[PDB]
Inverse folding.
């Protein structure tokens, strides 16, 4: 009875399949893939952020030169300068007039915002998708368990053992190269660590926040201070993190395909509705009811009464139930034409009980399996009027 | 610099209007609002536009769904199956 | 002058190309790919190791049953047993004779060796190869820098900027699935986490060493203790980590192709000599000598004197140098037929100086470019006698 089932990847709607175990009473499913969070394999390549030209205070030798050296600070720009007369609080102070030397030095450093407000590149591989699958199973009526997709993983949470996927729809909405910012995720071809052109994205490129080493192509060019005054002309491109916040591109949670949402959290891409998942469950046999205890319902009749050719469960149909015992009777349309809101219907001794459903074909000729009794609920449906609210329960469009 | 949650923005709610697989949206913000969407087909066909001037816009919604982001107001979602009978 | 150069991937031998910048004096290279450590992209899938049936001490109820429960320990095998009379230091102690009950329980647990002596599976992707390229450049005479292969990465260590690869020879000697053990690396199709048949490799499958959860298919089957005595028959397959150490396969550092060595270190595969690498360097123009300062050497003559048709630099050739000034003169054979030991030759005013080389064609008709003066060093060579020592400098075999 290990109920294999191909199953559409779509998040917010149950998939009430039916266990046709030969010998005992069938049992309905209710498989709602409440989430499709993905979490691909990734690598933190480098944080970037806007620089801060945290200038070390220049040297001023008063009569003669002060040769600079290339200190190992990131992008340590330093250039000796002569021909000053530095006004500092008493007019000038160095008594020479051309031998007055000024050595300006400036290096690039991570902002304090780099720790917290920072873009973040990644080389993104495929990884392994997940889900908090609820099944309000059978008469168990509950399990809300986190699972995987790889087609040999069980998750014995509740009582049922369930194996999912691998899904066929391998579209990772993440590209190979991704930039990430706070919550807005950008599938951007970031240039690389160690290379980013100044002004362009990644002018600062630190491996992480702690990493004292980095790559700072900022085109930081010191110029001589003017007219014998102490200061430090640092001529520099404002960061490619400054832009990339107001001349950027749009976020993947606003431009992705096939229906995904995003988080700066394990780097999941939630709820990506695409393709199918070959899902298979091993039910606990204890949860089964033996066949000789559920009422046999045959010699019945089914008919629509007001079929709504729609998404919401507007389709209805009375069923002239013709039972033997009285009790519950799980139901399902093995044809995917009709999706039913009721998993189970209570029965007195051969009464009648309408259920709700939804279809996509004008003439819904769908079988209905009322606990081992098939029936065609043939009829005709009506279009609605009022179509602006969230996503459907029908999801069965085909040739009609 | 810390990760405070600023008391923060919110744009006035939209006026949802139905049409056949199409959202007319008479819209009227307080400030320039970046609206954007994601036609959830594998054809994404997204849209972006800062809206500061009130504008009736349109969105060809498909069968499977679209989502809708009126500023930092949370993202909406929409079933547009048929309406042409 | 950004000297592009296709370049054979082979570790322990320089590649003394020649910079033909139009306008200033040429400069030799000496590019020795001292290492080709690889470090593919990988994932720790599960450690395995040999189990330890660390039996919890069984219960012995003296008169009546003790139902066992399935505790969540890994492979928690537990089976109630009756019909004992347990001799414990005073003869038996439970006064009944069949109602004497014994509940044996045993679970699987990581050995203490699992922390330290443990196989280690991986799903292995391709990643990005590296090298500590020495160049004893030009007159710079030194840089020993660690680089990459991806064909836009520089490494400004020394003074030269150098871009390497991507190599064309994408044979990762690692397979997709790999097992790893201490230092011996096995490109083994490990079954998977969560599945490994008992006795077979991966009977124990722990994600990591810390991971309290695991998969222990050991076929652990308790049997009843004998003849009314306290003990715990645990019938079990000795591990698939016990075998896999004496019925294993051979290591990839002993069975790989195309010439690799291995380490349990970043999971590199060193020194994989295969294919070519399109390497390109931006020399510091300061290191160039202008053309009007090196002696012009033309009106010369070259001839072999004892050419050795071999690998070691046995080939020699005097050159009737006809200089203008006196000084150094970098040399190279732009044809790959001849590989030369000397990058540079000193020159008095039109003297003669032999160099060493090695070839592969009986009639070596290779040009020699003595600092902008070409010459054919035509001749004939002799086979050697003494061929059992490490790898060659010739590496130029072709049609001869």
């Amino acid at each position: 009875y290990e109920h294999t089932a191909v199953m559409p990847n779509k998040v917010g709607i149950p998939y009430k399949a039916l266990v046709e175990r030969p010998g005992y009473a069938p049992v309905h499913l209710q498989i709602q893939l409440v989430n499709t969070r993905i979490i691909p394999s990734t690598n933190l390549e480098y944080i970037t952020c806007k620089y801060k030209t945290k200038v070390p205070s220049p040297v001023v030798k008063c009569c003669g030169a002060t040769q600079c050296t290339s200190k190992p600070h990131p992008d340590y720009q330093c250039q000796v300068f002569t021909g000053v007369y530095p006004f500092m609080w008493g007019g000038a102070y160095c008594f020479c007039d051309t031998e007055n030397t000024q050595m300006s030095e400036a290096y690039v450093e991570r902002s304090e915002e780099c720790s917290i407000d920072h873009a973040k590149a990644y080389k993104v591989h495929t990884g392994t998708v997940q889900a908090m699958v609820n099944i309000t199973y059978g008469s168990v009526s509950w399990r809300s368990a986190d699972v995987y997709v790889n087609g040999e993983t069980p998750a014995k949470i509740g009582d049922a053992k369930l194996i999912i996927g691998p899904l066929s729809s391998a579209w990772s909405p993440f590209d190979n190269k991704v930039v990430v910012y706070g919550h807005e995720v950008y599938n951007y071809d970031f240039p690389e660590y160690g290379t980013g052109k100044a002004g362009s994205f990644g002018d600062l490129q630190s491996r992480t926040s702690t990493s004292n080493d980095l790559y700072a192509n900022t085109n930081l060019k010191l110029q001589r201070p003017q007219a014998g005054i102490v200061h430090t002309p640092f001529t520099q491109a404002p960061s490619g993190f400054e832009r990339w916040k107001r001349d950027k591109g749009a976020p993947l949670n606003d431009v992705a395909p096939f229906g995904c949402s995003i988080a700066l959290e394990p780097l999941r891409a939630e709820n990506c509705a695409v393709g199918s998942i070959p899902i298979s469950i091993d039910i606990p046999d204890a949860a089964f009811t033996r066949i000789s205890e559920t009422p046999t319902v045959s010699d019945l009749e089914c008919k629509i009464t007001e079929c709504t050719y729609a998404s919401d469960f507007g389709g209805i149909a009375t069923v002239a139930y013709k039972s033997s015992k009285a009790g519950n009777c799980p139901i399902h349309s093995p044809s995917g034409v009709a999706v039913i809101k009721e998993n189970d219907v209570t029965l007195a001794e051969s009464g009648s009980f309408t259920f709700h459903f939804s279809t996509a074909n004008i003439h819904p000729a769908f079988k209905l399996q009322v606990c081992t009794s098939a029936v065609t609920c043939k009829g005709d449906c009506k279009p609605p009027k009022d179509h602006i609210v969230d996503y459907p329960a029908q999801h069965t469009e085909s040739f009609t | 610099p810390v990760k405070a949650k600023c008391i923060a923005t919110l744009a006035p709610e939209p006026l949802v209007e139905h049409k056949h697989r199409t959202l007319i949206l008479h819209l009227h913000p307080d400030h320039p609002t970046l609206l954007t969407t994601r036609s959830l087909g594998s054809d994404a066909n997204p849209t972006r536009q800062w809206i500061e001037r009130p504008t009736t816009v349109n969105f060809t919604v498909t069968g499977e769904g679209l989502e809708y982001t009126w500023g930092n107001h949370p993202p909406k979602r929409v079933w547009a199956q048929e309406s042409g009978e």
In short: Strands of chain B lie at 15-19, 22-27, 33-37, 47-51, 55-60, 66-68, 76-78.
